[PDB]
């Protein structure tokens, strides 16, 4: 019997340096976690101890911190090569800077194979990207070979900017012929490594004949066997076992996000590549694991270029700016109220009509909290992690019916850590989750524009309201198809980080609170 | 039979120039009201038409606009002499600048008798103020004489700064011997002119034998017979008839406030001074009445010194700043939310503990609205009328029990246009007016200080909270005795107008709304 050790990371999101426990900028260095230097110490320790080791990434290394704003993927290719990753699957955020933002910094500079079987290149692009990413790779591991098939979220054209020359096929339809090709090459050990979320990973384990292990990403799934070591609540045991349609037990693994944990799974295979057993758990990369000095000195060299983004203080916060998913995707979060107050302030600074009183913001668009214990200081860097996408805060004209539909969509699948949960400004919404989806909004009061003194009045279906929202939502992003389809007017506004930055500078000291903007019945 | 015409003003409050309909600074001159120039045209017209005329003031000429901030009462003595007032009764605001602020500008410069029978001077002051104000005056009117007895609110030591050398006696106890003295002088026509409010005026008409007419002030009572000409709702017919204990019908009159109306009452007396009948109504001093050119040119001369208080713009409002009594004494008003946000902002600008999240503000302390149609401009003058008293915004430490008592007091006599109604910041209060007084607060949630993210939690009786409030409330003003008696700590803060001014300058453009801080069940 032959034992393989799979070490996996996913949704790291430019978290190259060690972070606070909430994955925001490290301040109190003694209690910091993750980062590539720490991950390198743990990986090295496992390589010294285990004979057959694979270090894999299931996508979304791109986007999240000033590391990616400045280096545009050169930091990813450099440090992923430094850690000696054996393979990576393409994620949706790898396309955020177009195909060009993927090809030049990453595909051309990685010393490891970058995979995706369901991505087909066509037209002019076909010749330009050919062989820069592969559907599968056969990797020698000790005296054995292990086949790795890659996959990327089929919904990527709506999540990113991959362009019109890439076709995103159904994962299962595209993976089965590639697995069948590995089987003809007599590769009997097969890992499906990809980026579509835990729900699709379970479908790949059930339906794709020949896959032994599924290593996923995109849904930031925390899986654990026993008592977890930190604040993350497990969504199931590690590994998650799926029984395939052909009757084989298939472990499905995921390792949360932000490089806080290193996934770790041991598979005992027999001579014919049948999985005998599997055990593991994600490894919390805390303070106990010391950062590698060589990687850390290299991280510090690259850090010089970034320091001029933290030299200038925009203002102060005397309160924790809760930009976490556990807060901003489930209820009113003060980071969400702050950003919506900044949007309304930027639009009301230059103004019955002409005015704009309301704001809506997808909770999943807020990508990091900001801590108040660092002397209170807010820099362009702390703000760069909250709002990393470089989008705009647009003005839209919506019928009350359209706004009520967007609010119904906001909680249609409440309890899935779905980022469509809306943060608001100039709106008082009450939800009753005991009611059937599509009828959960029990109260929707909005701030009048056509009134001398502003006050909250019930939303009228036949009335038309002006709403400030991300360009992402206006384009039907996060399943807000009703906004794109039913809007009556759409104007482009200022860059997201600049709107929030000018506001923080004006206010000097900020203290946003949870005020009852969103309530539950 | 002999007919007397009584023209009366009360609670003018430094409204020397014509004002908007809400009694704030005149902008659209075509639809402006009141002012001394307009009042002079109407009074002159009545003097040309009627043989026996008395022009009286029932108090509170002092405090309200930049006219009083700058001239400290010299404008009152000058323009009241110009209009040829025959008498004035002392009001509580005439003592706001101490006895010295009353003696030097007004008592020493008025060419008319200034009256109060229930104010007794003692100790060192007795010799200094002797004869500068009188208990009564006998005025020749045509071939007849009319006696005028004055009175001032017994509660003045708590409302103002009259000092420890003036005794404020019971109105009825002090008025009866002065009326009896006029009766021995065979004065058969007697007017009681004073400043204690409509409720006390009715008691004087009922109890003081020999008073024929009561001309009052202090409660800003609007009395009208028929259909009123403006937005003011009558509190009863004009005149209000009180049947005395000795069986005589006694008219009681009051003419609202801010010089918007001129009270006008005709009394037909018989040969023995018995009131036969009385009819009248307040005269709305609107645009139809033209301003006297001589008084207006004199008003413009004095206006030069004031212009450097309007030359500098503090910021802009895009919304009407509702500082009216009809709003701020009955429900949440946006002027109240603004001032409470300015108080919390001034105290949080330099800060679990040390912080202050809550604000309370007596609604009656907000003395004027600000209009947004004047290009949006907010000047030191517009702000001077909102906050004319020159008080401070103090920090106090209160038990939850004390705060609940202050909120119970806030609505104990709801529906009387009582200024104790509280405006708030960092507090969510719900009242149920159908409940018995002392038990009307059904919900009282406050913003936590001892929490990383601020949020609204129920008030705990056994807990201690930090509240920013006017120095007036800390001293038990407006019947908030529980604040003065039960507070655990009291620190003096910055001047009220400066706190609000620095905030408006920081914000640049303001838009406070009615947000659900105060609700009714
Ligand atoms: O890491 P992911 O692959 O995104 C999976 P997740 O559970 O961590 O985050 C999902 C949430 O994030 C929201 N979201 C993602 N990208 C964007 C985004 N920009 C991405 C982008 C799109 C097109 C071109 C370039 C960049 N803008 C906004 Cl406002 N919201 C976004 C939105 F997609 C959702 O609420
Ligand atoms: O014109 P008035 O004689 O006052 C009768 P009104 O029905 O028009 O106003 C009553 C309201 O006004 C409130 N109030 C009055 N004076 C003050 C005041 N300053 C007066 C003062 C007191 C002592 C010395 C000097 C000035 N400060 C504050 Cl915050 N609130 C006040 C307080 F008294 C009440 O809520
Ligand atoms: Ca196998
Ligand atoms: Ca008489
Ligand atoms: Zn991701
Ligand atoms: Zn993803
Ligand atoms: Zn008054
Ligand atoms: Zn008064």
């Amino acid at each position: 019997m032959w034992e393989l050790t799979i070490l996996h990371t996913n949704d790291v999101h430019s978290r190259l340096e060690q972070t606070s426990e909430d994955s925001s900028k490290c301040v109190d260095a003694s209690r910091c976690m993750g980062g590539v230097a720490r991950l390198f110490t743990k990986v090295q320790q496992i390589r010294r101890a285990e004979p057959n080791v694979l270090l894999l990434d299931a996508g979304d290394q791109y986007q999240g911190t000033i590391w990616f704003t400045v280096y545009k993927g050169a930091e990813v290719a450099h440090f992923m090569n430094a850690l000696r990753y054996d393979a990576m699957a393409l994620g949706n955020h790898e396309f955020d800077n177009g195909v060009e933002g993927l090809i030049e910094p990453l595909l051309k500079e990685a010393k490891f194979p970058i995979l995706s079987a369901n991505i087909k290149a066509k037209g002019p692009l076909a010749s330009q990207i050919s062989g820069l990413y592969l559907p599968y790779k056969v990797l020698p591991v000790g005296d054995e070979v292990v086949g790795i098939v890659g996959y990327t979220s089929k919904e990527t054209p709506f999540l990113s900017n991959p362009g019109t020359n890439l076709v995103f096929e159904d994962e299962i339809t595209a993976l089965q012929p590639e697995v069948d090709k590995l089987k003809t090459l007599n590769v009997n050990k097969i890992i499906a490594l990809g980026h579509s979320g835990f729900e699709m990973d379970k479908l790949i384990a059930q339906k794709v004949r020949g896959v032994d292990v599924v290593v996923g990403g995109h849904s930031n799934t925390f899986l654990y066997t026993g008592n977890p070591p930190s604040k993350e609540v497990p969504a199931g045991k590690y590994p998650f076992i799926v029984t395939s349609d052909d009757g084989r037990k298939v472990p499905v693994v995921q390792a949360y996000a932000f490089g806080k944990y290193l996934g770790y799974l041991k598979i005992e295979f027999d001579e014919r590549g049948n999985v005998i057993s599997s055990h593991g758990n994600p490894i919390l990369l805390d303070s106990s694991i010391p950062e590698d000095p060589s990687i850390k000195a290299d991280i510090n060299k690259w850090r010089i270029k970034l320091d001029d983004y933290s030299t200038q203080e925009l203002g102060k916060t005397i309160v924790y700016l809760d930009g976490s998913s556990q807060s901003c995707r489930f209820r009113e979060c003060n980071m969400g109220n702050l950003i919506c107050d900044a949007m309304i302030n930027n639009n009301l600074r230059h103004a019955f009509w002409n005015h704009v009183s309301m704001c809506i913001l997808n909770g999943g668009g807020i990508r990091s909290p900001i801590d108040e214990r660092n002397d209170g200081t807010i820099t362009w860097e702390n703000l760069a992690a909250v709002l990393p996408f470089g989008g705009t805060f647009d003005l839209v004209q919506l019928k009350g019916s359209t706004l009520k539909k967007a609010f119904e969509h906001s909680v249609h699948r409440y309890g899935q850590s779905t980022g469509e949960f809306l943060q608001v400004g100039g709106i008082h919404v009450v939800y009753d989750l005991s009611r059937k989806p599509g009828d959960r909004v029990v109260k929707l009061d909005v701030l009048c524009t056509k009134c001398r003194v502003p006050s909250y009045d019930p939303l009228k279906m036949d009335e038309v309201y002006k709403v400030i929202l991300p360009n992402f939502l206006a384009n039907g992003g996060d399943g807000f198809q009703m906004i794109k389809d039913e809007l009556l007017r759409h104007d482009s506004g200022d860059q997201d980080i600049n709107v929030v930055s000018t506001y923080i500078s004006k206010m000097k000291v900020i203290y946003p609170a949870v005020e009852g903007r969103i309530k539950f019945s």
Side-chain angles (χ1 to χ4, degrees), chain A:
Chain A
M1 277 55 76
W2 188 92
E3 195 176 54
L4 175 71
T5 310
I6 301 176
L7 311 177
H8 57 105
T9 56
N10 61 282
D11 306 84
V12 170
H13 284 298
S14 323
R15 253 50 161 229
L16 276 93
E17 291 180 79
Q18 71 181 343
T19 65
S20 136
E21 95 178 331
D22 69 2
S23 310
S24 78
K25 187 161 192 186
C26 179
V27 181
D28 175 51
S30 69
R31 291 168 177 89
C32 281
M33 285 157 204
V36 294
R38 194 169 271 110
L39 175 60
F40 187 92
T41 300
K42 180 53 71 165
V43 166
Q44 174 165 94
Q45 168 173 209
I46 296 156
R47 285 171 174 150
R48 294 194 268 206
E50 305 305 329
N52 313 307
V53 177
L54 286 168
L55 175 66
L56 314 178
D57 189 88
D60 279 358
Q61 274 278 336
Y62 268 39
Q63 211 72 268
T65 85
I66 206 85
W67 279 86
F68 186 76
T69 302
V70 175
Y71 293 106
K72 304 167 187 301
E75 79 293 1
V76 170
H78 183 85
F79 289 102
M80 280 192 80
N81 288 339
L83 267 49
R84 290 175 234 108
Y85 273 85
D86 305 283
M88 191 190 164
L90 286 168
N92 52 284
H93 286 291
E94 269 74 55
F95 297 89
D96 284 2
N97 284 351
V99 281
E100 214 71 282
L102 176 61
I103 293 169
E104 303 304 333
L106 186 55
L107 306 186
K108 280 189 176 172
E109 308 298 333
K111 292 167 197 175
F112 52 82
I114 299 197
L115 317 153
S116 193
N118 71 303
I119 304 172
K120 311 269 131 77
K122 68 177 197 282
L125 180 66
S127 36
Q128 296 155 226
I129 205 166
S130 184
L132 294 184
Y133 74 99
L134 298 172
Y136 72 78
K137 187 75 189 203
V138 183
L139 289 90
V141 177
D143 302 335
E144 289 281 345
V145 303
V146 179
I148 310 174
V149 291
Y151 61 96
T152 306
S153 175
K154 186 205 308 203
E155 65 170 32
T156 296
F158 310 101
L159 312 178
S160 200
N161 197 25
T164 69
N165 287 320
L166 285 177
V167 179
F168 284 85
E169 291 198 341
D170 179 66
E171 293 90 341
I172 292 162
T173 303
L175 288 157
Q176 195 63 74
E178 303 306 324
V179 178
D180 292 5
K181 268 161 186 151
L182 282 158
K183 289 268 145 270
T184 64
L185 293 185
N186 280 118
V187 180
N188 59 30
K189 291 175 278 299
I190 301 172
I191 303 164
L193 171 73
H195 202 85
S196 313
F198 184 57
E199 293 308 321
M200 180 56 63
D201 300 343
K202 288 193 275 171
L203 287 167
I204 294 162
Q206 184 196 331
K207 306 277 173 198
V208 184
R209 298 165 299 272
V211 166
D212 298 313
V213 208
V214 178
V215 180
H218 190 54
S219 45
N220 307 311
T221 309
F222 186 58
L223 297 181
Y224 208 80
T225 299
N227 251 275
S230 191
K231 299 193 103 180
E232 293 71 31
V233 175
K237 292 180 292 293
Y238 185 109
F240 184 91
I241 309 292
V242 165
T243 302
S244 65
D245 283 343
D246 51 322
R248 306 172 292 98
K249 296 298 181 240
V250 183
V252 174
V253 292
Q254 190 150 172
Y256 179 57
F258 317 127
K260 179 162 166 177
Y261 298 89
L262 168 64
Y264 175 93
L265 180 76
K266 276 176 172 170
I267 303 110
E268 182 92 67
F269 289 103
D270 70 22
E271 316 99 81
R272 292 275 181 112
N274 296 120
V275 171
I276 296 306
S277 68
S278 68
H279 69 278
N281 255 333
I283 306 165
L284 176 83
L285 299 165
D286 64 11
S287 63
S288 76
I289 308 153
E291 284 183 299
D292 186 73
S294 295
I295 305 296
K296 178 66 187 275
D298 192 31
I299 274 289
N300 291 346
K301 186 190 158 176
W302 283 67
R303 233 286 175 190
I304 307 157
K305 202 172 175 180
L306 316 181
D307 284 323
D308 62 80
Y309 287 90
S310 41
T311 308
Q312 234 232 308
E313 169 189 275
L314 317 169
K316 287 204 183 295
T317 187
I318 50 163
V319 308
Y320 177 81
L321 295 169
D322 195 353
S324 69
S325 95
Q326 289 295 84
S327 270
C328 298
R329 297 190 194 205
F330 291 85
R331 58 204 64 90
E332 173 179 2
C333 71
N334 71 327
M335 182 72 90
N337 290 343
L338 170 71
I339 305 163
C340 266
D341 295 354
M343 297 161 66
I344 287 157
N345 196 263
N346 164 267
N347 237 267
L348 283 185
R349 208 89 120 91
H350 314 260
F352 288 159
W353 41 96
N354 256 298
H355 279 160
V356 288
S357 55
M358 302 139 58
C359 173
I360 65 166
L361 189 62
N362 55 308
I366 299 155
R367 308 287 293 204
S368 179
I370 298 181
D371 206 272
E372 76 290 8
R373 297 169 303 192
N374 189 349
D375 204 85
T377 315
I378 299 163
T379 54
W380 193 269
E381 174 185 6
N382 306 145
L383 271 191
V386 178
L387 304 147
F389 310 116
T392 60
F393 286 147
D394 299 353
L395 165 57
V396 157
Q397 238 186 329
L398 299 158
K399 285 132 77 183
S401 51
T402 315
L403 265 148
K404 167 63 157 66
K405 276 185 174 176
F407 273 98
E408 281 296 351
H409 179 76
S410 166
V411 297
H412 86 274
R413 62 183 164 180
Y414 187 97
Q416 279 178 50
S417 191
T418 50
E420 75 258 23
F421 187 83
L422 293 173
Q423 296 300 323
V424 302
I427 298 160
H428 287 173
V429 66
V430 190
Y431 301 116
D432 182 354
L433 305 170
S434 95
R435 295 176 84 89
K436 277 169 174 175
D439 211 84
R440 293 194 159 149
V441 174
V442 294
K443 191 189 258 287
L444 192 44
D445 296 336
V446 304
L447 201 48
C448 60
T449 48
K450 182 128 174 170
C451 49
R452 285 189 74 188
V453 175
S455 73
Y456 286 84
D457 286 306
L459 182 99
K460 291 178 252 180
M461 306 283 280
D462 340 59
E463 269 242 340
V464 170
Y465 308 86
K466 289 192 198 86
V467 191
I468 316 296
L469 42 63
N471 64 325
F472 183 78
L473 288 198
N475 300 145
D478 251 348
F480 284 95
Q481 187 73 355
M482 77 297 284
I483 293 169
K484 188 203 186 199
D485 282 353
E486 307 172 10
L487 63 88
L488 309 167
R489 166 83 66 182
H490 179 222
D491 308 271
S492 311
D494 305 339
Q495 275 265 330
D496 54 2
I497 184 159
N498 305 61
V499 162
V500 180
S501 185
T502 299
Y503 184 72
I504 293 162
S505 286
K506 193 256 275 294
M507 301 307 288
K508 298 251 82 216
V509 194
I510 60 157
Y511 43 96
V514 175
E515 312 169 324
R517 287 184 200 191
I518 304 163
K519 287 177 180 170
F520 291 101
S521 185

